Amino acid sequence: YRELEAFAAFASDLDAASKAQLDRGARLVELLKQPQYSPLAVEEQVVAIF
Amino acid sequence: DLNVEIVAVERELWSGPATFVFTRTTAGEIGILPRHIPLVAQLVDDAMVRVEREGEDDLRIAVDGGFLSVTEETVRILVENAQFESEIDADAAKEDAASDDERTAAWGRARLRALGQ
């Protein structure tokens, strides 16, 4: 994703599969985003990544 | 009344109101007043157009291979290259009228027939 993010900003258009990968990565990155002083037990980490 | 829209392939040249419009279509000379029946006619190679409107002087247009569409409200003239009389270089028209190329000669003749020549 983080290579596709840079590629997309300048490509006129992208394949539907590439757009699907972009939309999946834009959600994975937000998923890994986490606030301070709020650790998650592995029990919640596995579900969140799932 | 009529509103004459002389529109070229690149741009619209004229869209003012008019009372009468005259031009030499491939079927002969035609004059159009308001409420004329819808019509489509190909202008001749050297066709010129003359527009008569309220007050202003007659407007003469050199038209290169245009088409004339009389419609319920607008008489639209679609042109490849259209030149008003004020934009004509008369000497250039005179020189081009004798050109060997048929299309260039026809365009020169259209410019002259507008120039009043």
């Binding site: 900003a9 300048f10 006129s12 | 392939v9 690149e10 491939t26 029946i37």
Partner: protein
């Protein structure tokens, strides 16, 4: 090494300035080309309207409207820029063109090349595919004269000399400033579309015959204008990308120059204090 890094920084700064200027000029020219497309639209609409009327009063048997019995050859009009710095633009066109060829090859019709633009001309000159005719110098600012010449040549080839049994135009449609897509359109033989529910002089058949070439010329003109607008948009995007890359290169080279400067200062101090500590 620091001298090389300073020179590289100066180079990247100059290139950043040039690409930024090109980006702004390309924005202005996007505006100009899109305004020209808008200006050309009404004539296209009206000629299409009168063509529909003539067809409604025509036999629809003109050669431009009927499929050759056995299509053995097809023309392809690739519209391309005549100057670079447009990023993927030309490639996006050219790739699509080859895609079309793969279709034409699969359908048994060998494509015959007509190219507009210097870049596509070089593209095909390196792959040794022969272009019958090429026009150049008006992709940045096309005029109806060029479009009429292109359309007349294409239509004469279609009517025919070996000639072609079909012709396509490959060009970059500008849908929005963000999107610019290469598409291929078959511009002859045209397909009659019955959409469902006037006089003519001297007859609608002769007017139809005189107007179909004019309609094809108008559509080629619209395609060229669309390609020019798309070229300017791609140039703006490519120059913005180049400016960002030049800025990032300037930042990286400035970090490298600072590291080299500190390293040289430390090395000089090391030599000086090694000499003192010996004396």
């Amino acid at each position: 090494t620091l001298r090389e890094l300073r020179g590289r920084i100066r180079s990247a700064g100059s290139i950043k300035k040039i690409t930024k200027a090109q980006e702004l000029i390309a924005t202005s020219r996007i505006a100009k080309a899109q305004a020209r497309v808008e200006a050309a639209r009404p004539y296209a609409a009206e000629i299409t309207n009168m063509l529909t009327e003539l067809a409604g009063a025509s036999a629809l048997d003109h050669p431009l409207l009927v499929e050759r019995k056995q299509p053995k050859r097809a023309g392809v009009l690739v519209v391309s820029s005549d100057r670079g710095l447009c990023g993927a633009y030309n490639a996006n066109v050219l790739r699509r063109a080859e895609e079309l060829f793969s279709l034409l090859r699969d359908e048994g019709k060998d494509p015959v090349l007509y190219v507009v633009g210097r870049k596509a001309l070089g593209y095909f000159s390196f792959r040794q595919r022969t272009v019958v005719e090429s026009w150049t110098g008006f992709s940045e600012r096309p005029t109806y004269e060029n479009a009429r010449e292109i359309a007349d040549t294409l239509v004469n080839a279609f009517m025919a000399i070996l000639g072609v049994d079909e012709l396509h135009i490959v060009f970059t449609e500008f849908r929005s400033m963000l999107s610019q897509t290469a598409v291929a359109r078959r511009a002859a033989p045209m397909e009659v579309e019955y959409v469902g529910e006037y006089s003519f002089e001297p007859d609608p058949e002769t007017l139809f015959d005189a107007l179909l070439p004019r309609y094809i010329a108008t559509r080629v003109y619209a395609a060229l204008l669309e390609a020019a607008a798309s070229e300017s948009a791609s140039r703006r995007r490519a120059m913005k990308s180049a400016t960002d890359n030049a800025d990032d290169l300037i930042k990286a080279l400035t970090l490298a120059a600072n590291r080299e400067r500190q390293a040289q200062i430390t090395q000089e101090i090391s030599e000086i204090v090694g000499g003192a500590n010996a004396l």
